[PDB]
Amino acid sequence: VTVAISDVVVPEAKKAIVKGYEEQDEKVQKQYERGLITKEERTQELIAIWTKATNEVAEAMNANFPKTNPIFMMVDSGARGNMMQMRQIAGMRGLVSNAKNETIPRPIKASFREGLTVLEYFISTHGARKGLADTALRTADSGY
Amino acid sequence: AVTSIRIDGVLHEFTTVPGVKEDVTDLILNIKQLVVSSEHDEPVVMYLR
Amino acid sequence: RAMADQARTIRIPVHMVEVINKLARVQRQMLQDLGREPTPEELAKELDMTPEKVIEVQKYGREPISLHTPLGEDGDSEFGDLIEDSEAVVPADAVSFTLLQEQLHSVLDTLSEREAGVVSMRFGLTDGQPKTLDEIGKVYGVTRERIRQIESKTMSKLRHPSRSQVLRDYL
């Protein structure tokens, strides 16, 4: 068992799913621009579309790993890790929350293997810091 | 191999000799790569001037 | 009067308070006019007193600090939580002294009854009360000089290179 960037295999079918749901997103954006839907309708439709895309990519990823992959062997045996983290590493990171607790209707369509752009990294820092602060306070609350 | 030194105007490793470009703690690293062979079972001594 | 008699935790009489106030006033005036901190010699000459007196007057006016002043950013301790108690019984020293006492009693036992008794009653080991030579002679019914003779003999006996090493370490 070893880790090399060639072991982290992103599914080969991610491109097609992402492209199709990007076409759907563009269609909804055009519909909103003309004026046949309000803002909340666009937000909810995009959130649903990208949740579906994330689930499809996760399923393809799960079906793609060979049974002898070092990372799949680490996760399957129960030694360490779980499936959400391996989805984030090789797949689609998904939807993230805003500075205020509310989903941003524009997902991070790139995994940590393919590298995030500047805006995606900035968006992820929000949840990162919120989780860190919650971890900081949980200790005192549980102690009391 | 070499096992110890002593310089004319030096008391410890953490100092410098007037006139040389290296600290006394870099001369030590430079003479650690000094490959020598010896035949005497006693601690022979050689001189650099 | 009341301020001089009630403004300090460690009270200072009125005259010494006056001296301290005058010294502070002179020092402040010298700092203002000259623009530099006055050295002790300048104050001594201006105030017409020895430099040691100026130093003592400076040391008298200091006010105490508190043991409850916080020192850490978090605030988990006070200034009085790291003051080592320099007048407690260190258990190692106490046990060492007890062992020394036991060893001394054991060594003094090897001597004769008379010599050990005179040493004990001369250094007051049993009661802690030193006694004069004449009283020791009275109890022993001998001359004072004779008693002095016995003490020297035992003192040299213990300080010999045959019985000293049992007591050298404890010194």
Add this chain to the structure above:
Amino acid sequence: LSAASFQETTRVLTDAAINAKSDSLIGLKENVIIGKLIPAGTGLSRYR
């Protein structure tokens, strides 16, 4: 004693003083505070 050592020390003490409450030292915290064997585990008189 236990209530005072928990929290609201001033209120607990000013109430106990007026009520003249007497502590019998039957818990764990009281024995821990005063420095004797807790009435649990090996500190029970059945085992000692």
Add this chain to the structure above:
Amino acid sequence: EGIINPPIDELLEATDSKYSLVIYAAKRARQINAYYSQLGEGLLEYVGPLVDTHVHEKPLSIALREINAGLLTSEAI
């Protein structure tokens, strides 16, 4: 060998629970240590050890060995 000897399961066959075994072994160890300390001086009621020992063995280990072998009895007072 070491601190896992004798096994706890075998020891617990001689008492009721761990809590009583602790006091049983501790009292026996104190008796053995007192016997060693005052062995030279005048004789006292203390006895033991009842088993083969080592050069400088912890009295608690000897007490546990004696308890396991079945050379002691605990009453109630």
Add this chain to the structure above:
Amino acid sequence: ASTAPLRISFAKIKEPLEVPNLLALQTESFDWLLGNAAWKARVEAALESGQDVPTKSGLEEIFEEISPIEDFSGSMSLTFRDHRFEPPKNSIDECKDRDFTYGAPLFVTAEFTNNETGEIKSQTVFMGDFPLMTNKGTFVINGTERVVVSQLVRSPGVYFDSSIDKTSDKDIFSAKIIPSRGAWLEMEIDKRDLVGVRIDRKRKQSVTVLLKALGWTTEQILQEFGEYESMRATLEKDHTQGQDDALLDIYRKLRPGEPPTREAAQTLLENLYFNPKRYDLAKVGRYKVNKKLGADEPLDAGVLTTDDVIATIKYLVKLHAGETETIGENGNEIVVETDDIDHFGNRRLRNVGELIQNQVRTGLARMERVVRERMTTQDVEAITPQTLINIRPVVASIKEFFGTSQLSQFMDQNNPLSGLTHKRRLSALGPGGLSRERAGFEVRDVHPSHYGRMCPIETPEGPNIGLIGSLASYGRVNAFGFIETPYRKVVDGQVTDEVDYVTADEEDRFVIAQANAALDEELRFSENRVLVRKRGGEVDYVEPSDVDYMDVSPRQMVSVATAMIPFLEHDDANRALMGANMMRQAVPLIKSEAPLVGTGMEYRCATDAGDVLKAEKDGVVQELSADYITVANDDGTYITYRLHKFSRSNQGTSVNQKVVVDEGDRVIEGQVLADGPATEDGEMALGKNLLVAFMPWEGHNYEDAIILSQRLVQDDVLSSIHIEEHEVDARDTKLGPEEITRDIPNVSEEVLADLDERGIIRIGAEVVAGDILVGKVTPKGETELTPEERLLRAIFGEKAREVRDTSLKVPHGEIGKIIGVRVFDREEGDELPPGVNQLVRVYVAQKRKITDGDKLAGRHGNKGVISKILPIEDMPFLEDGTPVDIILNPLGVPSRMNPGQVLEIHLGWLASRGWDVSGLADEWAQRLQAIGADKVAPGTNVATPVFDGAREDELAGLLNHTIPNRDGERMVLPTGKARLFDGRSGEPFPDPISVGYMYILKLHHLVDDKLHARSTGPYSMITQQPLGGKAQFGGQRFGEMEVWALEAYGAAYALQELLTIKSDDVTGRVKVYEAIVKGENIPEPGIPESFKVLIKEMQSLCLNVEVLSSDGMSIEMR
């Protein structure tokens, strides 16, 4: 500069703007404060360049603010002007050696004018020694080097807020006017639609009463504030009328008890709000109020005005009504909306200059109060400016600020990066800020206005998370304290070369593109669907016509320390944060080595940090030695530079500078002449390159541990020099002074062997725990000895000397040679404090090699403690006999979501081996030929910018074209995995293993400083428990949770002994020690002292605590 070491870069984007002077944030502020010639050039260089409007230096502004000073009658006046500075009396080196405070004298031209006969008494007044700031943005206070960090505060102004009550299900509005140095006023509309005018948080009045007091009649209010029913309802529910009646009502409500009067109320209100002496919102406050409400009142002076009050009331009532836009005074129109208190449009930055100005102003307030009081009380015609001005308060305030202030911090000097990051730090807590425990979860968030102004990655991981941050690389501080960022202007879809500095509000106004936007190369966007940021910070796709700004470059949002992590975009935010926070703890090793695969930000950081010696004027090096470099400049003058050698930093490390030039070389200005503590040829180098293999190895690297090779100990790869200083002073006592000498009363002569003539250890001597460094004797006077001691003395005849020893000895567990001895005598003119005859300092230095227990870590948040150091022979070695220097567990990579380290390792191997890809007509090979990265000699360093690094395609392709080794084979297969051999068994490992070169740092968490044990030692004073800490011996605390665990096991005797005969049983500690030493039974515990102290305190509170026995009889506890 052009004289930088080679580093082949993988960047594909051309940056149009260079990073600014990273130290400007402090130097520029202090230059403004002083009024230096540099600030004069900057302000004169404001010819349509920069926001350098303020023409007044800080001290000039303060003096002009405090002038003129007049008495209650105006008979005479006093004024200050034309502040001047004299050269400093001591250099930095002298100040640090002798523990001075590097500063300069300050003179003020003060003139006293008497209105009778027209007198003028202009003269010079000395206003104390003003501390100066070095060229590195640091102060030298009392010999120690300090840093003043900026502060993030809430800018003064008017803020409108709304809240919703879950119970009443109605919205409640509020409006505050928060000044600087003033009294607040807050209006609020509650569920009852009543316009409360809460004043100075004093209960709750009605705005109608205040309006009537201000001089408004009911008819005017009705005809003006009529369209909105809330204020009509407030008016009807008044039951009062008349200006005098309302004014007296207000005074009675807010100042009850005193005899009400009309004049008292008016004067009180004017003093509260309209008096500039006790209320002054600064230029920022006036600017913000004008911007929000539209009033174009001049910024020359700011004091609350009635017009502002009515404007605020109008704004609040319109906002509550439901309006969205409004007509504003002296403006076209304004938008009605609530304010976000976290937006950097509302949060400003108080830099060093502003803080020092505030302290100087506070001192000058008392100074002028004293001046006016003494001017009034004393006589006239015999008074001159020199005898009126008392400068004690000013210097006292300056000293108070520079010492015992939360913003004047003891500098961090682990390495150049730590020092540079200590500056450029924005702290949101401190005097006038907020508190650690009161900050909520909304002020610690990453607000979308932090982009390009504050880093979102670098923050402390403790309970300070979010309250301390770092300024972004391109960030700049406005004239009013706000933070600006640069953007390239794009017009008609064409990206021009005009850079505009934009603040948070202007950023909200526009739509900003993204840094890496593919272009047709004719300065025009390509894809027609560009991801851009919009008003609310939301990202959206837009066409290339709406865009009007673009980012200057990628990595515009990441701080200086976060821009040195290669492959940052492949790392989770948490791991990047940890790596950034953990790169500041690496220690400087004896031999430095720049990273093999780094970013482009090492040279700039190392040179701008100020720890690298740089040539001042071009010339040719004349003479060179490890202690100095003398260069003959071109203009005929010669200059000699000195280098620090084995100095000591604040943190105990060693500062040592190498020389990188030769005798015959030629140097241009800005060229690097000497390295720094942790630099190699000019660029930052915090660690070493080690050959790493990813695999579990017999469990020695289990659960984050690390296995090392013995080579790293043989060649001092991870060895560092550490220095400590020990200080002892001979002072005066009641029974005479103390003396320093080698005539110690009773010490075997062998100890006094390395001591010199005056009883101070010799330079070059090696010391071990218990050795004597300085020999000191303290008199003790008459004492009575115990009978046994006297008898023993009589035996051995050793007369007592009456003076005991207090010599200085090395603490327990310390070793090393003696580097330096510095001795100060009070009788040699040294400025020792009162009652300190002599002082002496001894420096001990030792070289530490890496050993198990020492903590190592990388740049991607991967840390661990060395748990094994194997011989070279039994290490997994490549097919050509090359052992690996470090073994890391792979199980930690995936679950932690930082694949960046694997990529760094692959690229490090590629850089180490070198490659040659020139004739390849391959897609990925073409991108390499357009940037000049075709042929790379083995061992060359490479650069992958933060967000524009090397794509995986290029790495995969290059891995197949490396230079074959001496045997004509490539050891690493195209999948990145090599084929290793087992060091011990000798058989090859079943499958290929991933190997490469990783950059490893040596953190400052060495096990030498962590170990500490105790059997017995010092004890506390009031309660007799052990003395916690490590400067003492100190016992480990046994808290509540441990007590609960022991109770849960059911172990009562262990707990009882842990609580009685180990901490508090005063008479039991000695008894147990004696029992152990004599080999017998441990005695029974007693009663702890803390219980007795508690009972004594309770009895002192007039409580009748008593302990009862079986029968109702007290015990009395002795």
Add this chain to the structure above:
Amino acid sequence: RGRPVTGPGNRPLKSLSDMLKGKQGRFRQNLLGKRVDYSARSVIVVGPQLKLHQCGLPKAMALELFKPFVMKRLVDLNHAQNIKSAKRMVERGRTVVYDVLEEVIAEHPVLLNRAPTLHRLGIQAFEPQLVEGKAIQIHPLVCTAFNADFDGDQMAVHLPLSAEAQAEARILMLSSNNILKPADGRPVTMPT
């Protein structure tokens, strides 16, 4: 009642009541939890060669923790004549002192603890053995019980003295008798 009095620095004075209340009063800081003697602390490393009931103490910490016992033992073996010479010999750090320490340390359990102590398996008794270094060695299996990682964590060592304390630490708190978890009954001392 009213405004508190203040001394230098304008900080409120401490009264009799303030000494009994709060997280830093007599009741909570000095009575329920105290500092103890015969205790040490250090960073933990991993030793996979140990058994489930063994721990590795650095010889400096072991020597400083067992000082009275080693002094008495080396007085017994005539390596010294009296406790004074024995104490000096131990302090100066001779060679035979460690040979004696290796045998006075046998069959003497030590309590290992890691703060925070969330449950009773956070304190466990191990049999010590000397190791060459400045870091403690912890069996890999007990980590889960301690929630202890090897990225800079530290642990504390306490020394039972009396026969009752030793019997408790040996029979009740031993490391190899605590496989199961009190919360639900599932093993925690398991390969992870």
Add this chain to the structure above:
Amino acid sequence: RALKRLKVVSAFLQTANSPKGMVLDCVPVIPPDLRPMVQLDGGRFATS
């Protein structure tokens, strides 16, 4: 109100306490060693 009052009125009715203990004529003084006046090195005194 009467129920609340009776709780404090009843306590003194039966127990050995008396209301007069709520007003002090003499004030106790804690032993000096619990409010130490320690002399730091250099002559500075620290109080409690």
Add this chain to the structure above:
Amino acid sequence: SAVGTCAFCYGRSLATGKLVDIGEAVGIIAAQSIGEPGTQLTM
């Protein structure tokens, strides 16, 4: 039970797999067991 609780109602001791002894401090064990997982419960 007149005094406290009794072993048979408490049942087996999950930490040892046998009937709970007659001196066990079940209250502190319950408190610790309930409170330990507090940090895992994401707020």
